[PDB]
Amino acid sequence: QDVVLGLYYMTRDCVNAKGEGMVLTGPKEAERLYRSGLASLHARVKVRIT
Amino acid sequence: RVTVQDAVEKIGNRFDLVLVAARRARQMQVGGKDPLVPEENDKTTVIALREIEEGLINNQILDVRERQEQQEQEAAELQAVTAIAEGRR
Amino acid sequence: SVITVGPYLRLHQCGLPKKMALELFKPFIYGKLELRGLATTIKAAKKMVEREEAVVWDILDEVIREHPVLLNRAPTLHRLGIQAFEPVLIEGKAIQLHPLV
Amino acid sequence: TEFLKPRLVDIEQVSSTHAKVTLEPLERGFGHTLGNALRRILLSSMPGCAVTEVEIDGVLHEYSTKEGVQEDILEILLNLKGLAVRVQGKDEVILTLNKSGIGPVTAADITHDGDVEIVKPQHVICHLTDENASISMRIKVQRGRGYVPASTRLLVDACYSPVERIAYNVEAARVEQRTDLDKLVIEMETNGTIDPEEAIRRAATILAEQLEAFVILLRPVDDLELTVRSANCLKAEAIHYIGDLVQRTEVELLKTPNLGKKSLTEIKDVLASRGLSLGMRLENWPP
Amino acid sequence: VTEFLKPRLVDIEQVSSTHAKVTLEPLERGFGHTLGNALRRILLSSMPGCAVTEVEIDGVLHEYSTKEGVQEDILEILLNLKGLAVRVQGKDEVILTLNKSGIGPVTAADITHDGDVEIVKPQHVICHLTDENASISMRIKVQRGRGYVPASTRIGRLLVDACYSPVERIAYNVEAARVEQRTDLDKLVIEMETNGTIDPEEAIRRAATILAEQLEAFVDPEFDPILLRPVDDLELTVRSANCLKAEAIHYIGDLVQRTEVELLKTPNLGKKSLTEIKDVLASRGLSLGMRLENWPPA
Amino acid sequence: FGIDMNTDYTLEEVGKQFDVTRERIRQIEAKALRKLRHPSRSEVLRSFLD
Amino acid sequence: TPEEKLLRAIFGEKASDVKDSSLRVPNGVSGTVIDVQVFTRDGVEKDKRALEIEEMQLKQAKKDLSEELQILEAGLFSRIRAVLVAGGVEAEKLDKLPRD
Amino acid sequence: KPLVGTGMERAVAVDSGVTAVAKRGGVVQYVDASRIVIKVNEDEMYPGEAGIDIYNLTKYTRSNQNTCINQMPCVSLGEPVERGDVLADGPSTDLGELAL
């Protein structure tokens, strides 16, 4: 149920017109930027995660 | 949940582990806290299980400690018990 | 009792109402109150606990520490119809169940 | 009116630069309140030094790649973001990095500046492959607040805040009678430039300093539901209210013309049923 | 090293007696929602206010009763009393008297005018007396407190669910503030809808005060128990109890220390009373002149 | 009280058993009961009534 | 039992002939007592129990008669008045003499 | 009353005798928690040979499932009511509409 609805929502493909071309600096900074601003319904961003 | 797979890994067939841990816990409540590896938390059952996880207890070793305990009961009295036996002929 | 969702619970946990726990673990609680100096005798412990006298609760927390309860729902079609959980004391009359189970 | 204020503390050091401090007692609704307030301050209003620009010799565009260097310029900037620097008293400092040889080019190879303190000297910035390769760059470090990407207006995404991640949990707290209490569990992930605790006290300091400029005796006997006889007798004895009755004693009432022992017993029962009695002194009848 | 701009109350737009708009003039961007949520959270639950907690209506014993001459039953009356908006000067408990005879609505305006007590909505209906021989006389107890404390959170006296919080609704807007200086400044506009018991400004300063006080930094069996029971547990006669209390004997431990000689020397204790006391004490394995040596521990 | 021999021996019987008069046995019975009832050590035995 | 004998003797409660069988409020329940009803065998030693309630029911019943006769009186006389006025008009005269 | 009804909620509360209705056209003489007195013949003078009607209301009665059945007066003194008009609402009913 909900859990799925959650995960599917956080990992859905998007046009990413807003959150485009983002260097993550790692999963942590990526999360910081995600919580902050300019990231909504996921984004087309490269992740530095080891 | 605490490292249960490792605990079972230390003693095959799961069930047998349950019986053993039970016996050890009965040891904890029967005589003294004693034992080893020593976190002192979460009661007798989990103290026994954590003990088994670190292979501190073990079935054979427990059986060995029991035989040594039988030797300890032999210790003391002994000559007095045999005195109680010799008086009765 | 009636069951309600318990999102904050760990998989090995369950929500157990305070009153229910108090009733279920009664002899254990008397025993513990006799071992520690909280009551002179089993009868005294009962008389005290019935009143719901304070510190009986904390004692109950000491009683269910590391202890497990079995939860069961009819119909029991497979062996997972009964499972063991570590009980967490909760306000309210409802049993709180983990969503994964 | 007083509220429950914090008591008993705990600190779970997950690592040298990652800790979990928790406040045991709080009132309901304060978990999310302080949690979100603090998360909003920490994720954007913390003061810290961060790399904002870099000038590498020979390099023009971030798409270029350098001869003798394993990683491309993008990865190098990506490493430069993680440069932890503590500067004495300045809002901008230039670091020079000259390095020739084979092997990793770490932050320890950066020219030792008197003011500038490098937290992690073993932090890898580059990797020189051949022994004829060399790098010479000028790293600009500025002081600011929050996460300010390079896309603001070479340039590097600026992470001024010393903290990488913030999390909180509300969890119902124990303690005495109240039952509906919460306890705020703050998960903090900083870079080690500044201590977690002092970072918390600093966020609290910023927040507080922002809030600086905003800181039965008169009831009739009929309510007792006595027998008609008893009520009428009491009224006949000038006893019209409970206050009148509670002043009389058993003796005096028995001295009245119409109230017997059955009735008196009844009066004692009904009065006892409401936490009242005969011979009660209220001294000052009436105001 | 850019010093921060600190918020200050700058405007109050009283849309009505119980609806206001308080705005803070200086704020940095992203601070609007923080204070907005903090303040809304404090205001909606942590505000202190007066509320009716007990009611004593004449002729009525239990709240399920209905009164001769009153349209609505007592439950509806108490339910009406929950909505009694009262502003008290400087007290944590006040008794209001309500005497009313006649035909028509019995409103809060008919409550006896007390100097301290201020009635926000005098036209607030408490009752409806139908016939002209009907009359009500009640004592409304008003107390100061916090949050929602139901009557179930424990005499012929009724209890009423307490709704202490003075604030019904809170809203906030972040809205970009003007001013040429800095340009990136906001202004927090809090739209408040309270019951009129408390003024907007002091509510804001109280929410902020509570918030600041929460942020207060980050740092780091022998003897018989029956001896400490009150004398009332002995269940003596009123006379004996009052006499003993008058002689500074408030507990059983105090009584068991006294001797017959000493007790007979008191101004109010005769042989009958002493007989009673010795009887009730002997009935529980106690007596007079009992030595417990160590009165008291702590 | 019959804790011994399962019979409630009379005061004269106990007195005869200890070679003392019935008044003496009633006296030591009374001081024993007195000791027991006293506030010290009364705990435990007490409250066991209801 | 001898232990209980000793206990009672120490505390002097004396063994009661009767045993407690009272009706108590069940667990998990509570509230306000709104009514009691008592029924006793005919010719039983009726006490204050069956007397107070009885007298109360008598008063309630009597008031139930007084109110119905009040409505009946103010219900029929207010109808015979409009009949009496028609023909033999007595405005200021009829509101003087007793209703009977 | 439900903000979204189907229009049958009046007829249900009507046909179940929980709600008290007026037999004939009239005017309300008295209103109480305990009783409602209505003086007939206001509309179409239907009542004859003694006019008025008294409706006693059920108050704090106990149902089979232990729910409390009590009626509350829905009218006011001097209000004009016609035949079949709602006088007192029963349990779980609002102004003659069904409230579950």
From Swiss-Prot, chain B:
Swiss-Prot/TrEMBL GO biological process terms: bacterial-type flagellum assembly; bacterial-type flagellum-dependent cell motility; cell motility; cellular response to cell envelope stress; DNA-templated transcription initiation; intracellular iron ion homeostasis; nitrate assimilation; protein-containing complex assembly
Keyword terms: DNA-directed RNA polymerase, Nucleotidyltransferase, Transcription, Transferase
EC supergroup of this enzyme: transferase
GO molecular function terms noted in the UniProt entry: bacterial-type RNA polymerase core enzyme binding; DNA binding; DNA-directed RNA polymerase activity
GO cellular component: cytosol; cytosolic DNA-directed RNA polymerase complex; RNA polymerase complex; transcription elongation factor complex
Signal peptide: none
EC number(s) stated in the UniProt entry for this protein: 2.7.7.6
Catalytic activity from the UniProt record: RNA(n) + a ribonucleoside 5'-triphosphate = RNA(n+1) + diphosphate
Alphabetized InterPro entries for the sequence: DNA-dir_RNA_pol_omega, Pol_omega/Rpo6/RPB6, RPB6/omega-like_sf
Domain of life: Bacteria
Disulfide bridge positions per record: none
Subunit structure of this chain's protein: The RNAP catalytic core consists of 2 alpha, 1 beta, 1 beta' and 1 omega subunit. When a sigma factor is associated with the core the holoenzyme is formed, which can initiate transcription. The rRNA transcription and antitermination complex (rrnTAC) consists of RNAP, NusA, NusB, NusE (rpsJ), NusG, SubB, ribosomal protein S4, DNA and precursor rRNA; S4 is more flexible than other subunits.
Family affiliation: Belongs to the RNA polymerase subunit omega family.
The protein, known as: DNA-directed RNA polymerase subunit omega
Curated annotation (Swiss-Prot), chain C:
UniProt modification remark: Acetylated on several lysine residues in the presence of glucose.
Species annotation: Escherichia coli (strain K12)
Subunit structure: The RNAP catalytic core consists of 2 alpha, 1 beta, 1 beta' and 1 omega subunit. When a sigma factor is associated with the core the holoenzyme is formed, which can initiate transcription. The rRNA transcription and antitermination complex (rrnTAC) consists of RNAP, NusA, NusB, NusE (rpsJ), NusG, SubB, ribosomal protein S4, DNA and precursor rRNA; S4 is more flexible than other subunits.
Similarity section: Belongs to the RNA polymerase beta' chain family.
Protein name per its UniProtKB record: DNA-directed RNA polymerase subunit beta'
Residues of the full protein shown: 353 to 453 of 1407
Superkingdom of origin organism: Bacteria
Record function comment: DNA-dependent RNA polymerase (RNAP) catalyzes the transcription of DNA into RNA using the four ribonucleoside triphosphates as substrates. Resistance to the antibiotics salinamide A, salinamide B, rifampicin, streptolydigin, CBR703, myxopyronin, and lipiarmycin can result from mutations in this protein.
Lineage of origin: Bacteria, Pseudomonadati, Pseudomonadota, Gammaproteobacteria, Enterobacterales
Name of the gene encoding the protein in the UniProt record: rpoC
Uses, biotech or industry: Co-administration of salinamide and rifampicin or salinamide and myxopyronin suppresses the emergence of resistance to both antibiotics.
UniProtKB/Swiss-Prot annotation, chain D:
Catalytic activity: RNA(n) + a ribonucleoside 5'-triphosphate = RNA(n+1) + diphosphate
Region feature Alpha C-terminal domain (alpha-CTD), mapped onto this chain: 216-287
Keywords: Acetylation, ADP-ribosylation, DNA-directed RNA polymerase, Nucleotidyltransferase, Transcription, Transferase
EC number: 2.7.7.6
Any one GO cellular component localisation term in the record: membrane
GO annotation terms (biological process): bacterial-type flagellum assembly; bacterial-type flagellum-dependent cell motility; cell motility; cellular response to cell envelope stress; DNA-templated transcription initiation; intracellular iron ion homeostasis; nitrate assimilation; regulation of DNA-templated transcription elongation
Modified residues (N6-acetyllysine): K261, K262
Stretches the record annotates as Alpha N-terminal domain (alpha-NTD): 1-215
Post-translational changes noted in the entry: Acetylated on Lys-261 and Lys-262 in the presence of glucose. PatZ controls acetylation of Lys-262 but not of Lys-261. (Microbial infection) ADP-ribosylated on both alpha subunits by the phage T4 protein ModA. ADP-ribosylated on only one of the alpha subunits by the phage T4 protein Alt.
CDD domains linked: RNAP_alpha_NTD (cd06928)
Gene3D superfamilies from the UniProt entry: 5' to 3' exonuclease, C-terminal subdomain, DNA-directed RNA polymerase, insert domain, RNA polymerase, RBP11-like subunit
Highest taxon of the lineage: Bacteria
Family annotation (InterPro entries): DNA-dir_RNA_pol_insert, DNA-dir_RNA_pol_RpoA/D/Rpb3, DNA-dir_RpoA, RBP11-like, RNAP_asu_C, RNApol_insert_sf
Positions carrying ADP-ribosylarginine: R229
Family: Belongs to the RNA polymerase alpha chain family.
NCBIfam families registered for this protein in UniProt: PRK05182.1-2, PRK05182.2-5, rpoA
Protein name: DNA-directed RNA polymerase subunit alpha
Curated annotation (Swiss-Prot), chain F:
Cysteine disulfide links: none
Region of interest: Sigma-70 factor domain-4: 1-38
Region spans: Interaction with anti-sigma factors: 22-37
DNA-binding region listed in the record: 11-30
Coiled-coil ranges from the UniProt annotation: none
Mutagenesis / variant outcome for changing R34 to D/E: 2-fold reduction in activation of class II Crp-dependent promoters
Subcellular location: Cytoplasm
Subunit structure: Interacts transiently with the RNA polymerase catalytic core formed by RpoA, RpoB, RpoC and RpoZ (2 alpha, 1 beta, 1 beta' and 1 omega subunit) to form the RNA polymerase holoenzyme that can initiate transcription. Identified in a complex containing RpoD, the RNA polymerase subunits RpoA, RpoB and RpoZ, CRP and DNA. Interacts with Rsd; this prevents interaction with the RNA polymerase catalytic core and with promoter DNA, and as a consequence, promotes transcription from promoters that require alternative sigma factors.
Domain notes: Contains 4 domains, connected by flexible linkers. In the active conformation, the domains are in an extended conformation, each making extensive interactions with the RNA polymerase catalytic core.
Family statement: Belongs to the sigma-70 factor family. RpoD/SigA subfamily.
Name the UniProt record assigns to this protein: RNA polymerase sigma factor RpoD
Lineage, broadest ranks: Bacteria, Pseudomonadati, Pseudomonadota, Gammaproteobacteria, Enterobacterales
Gene encoding the protein: rpoD
